[PDB]
């Protein structure tokens, strides 16, 4: 049956072939033959967004 925990797979694509790197750029996995490239997937709770909720309410009529 469907889950009820508001969790969804959060996919993050990383293309760092231009050379700019940070602490998260290494050690997470091997890069053999795919330098600067990575797919990250995790299950995370999608929270409520008061700011966006209020913004749509006030702004939905402007395309």
């Amino acid at each position: 049956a469907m889950a009820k925990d508001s969790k969804a797979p959060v996919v993050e694509i990383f293309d760092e072939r231009d050379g700019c790197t940070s602490a998260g750029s290494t050690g997470k996995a091997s890069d053999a033959g795919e330098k600067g490239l990575l797919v990250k997937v995790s299950m995370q709770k999608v929270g409520y967004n008061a700011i966006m909720a209020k913004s749509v309410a006030a702004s939905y009529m402007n395309a």
Binding site: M2, A8, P9, K28, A29, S30, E34, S42, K54, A57
Partner: protein, 176 residues
Amino acid sequence: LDAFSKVITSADGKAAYVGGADLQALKKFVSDGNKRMDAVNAIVSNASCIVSDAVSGMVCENPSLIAPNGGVYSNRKMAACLRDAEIILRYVSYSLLSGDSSVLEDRCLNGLKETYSSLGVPAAGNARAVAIMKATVNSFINNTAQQKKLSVPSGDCSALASEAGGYFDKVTSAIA
């Protein structure tokens, strides 16, 4: 795809990091390996734009949804809808990453119609939000949106775009 199934079954926030030989196998095991990555990026890197625009279009085409007793009346209900929209979007985006909809159907769609029906979440507004997201994701995969662009090598991604519309269609079918 055992690495993804691991972190999706556990649902504890653990990340799977796919690079190197793993990533190389992945792009060979799905179709259009490199383009598929750019298509997935088209979606998730615009997640907030996609969600905000769809729910806004759903409401502007039917302002009753935000009238008292409406489907998105009050920040609480509007916030829950934006959350559902992103949940649906990210399950669609994982389907395009993995090349099948099994997680989308099982973990997101199985029993979603009854859930919405018992709560009275209007099916017409829901289908419309899905439709706007679908249209939006179609322009971004093709890099044809009017404002925000994506820089990728030139070529055709129409097959991946169709696969993406199919996952949106399963959402649409599922919520009737």
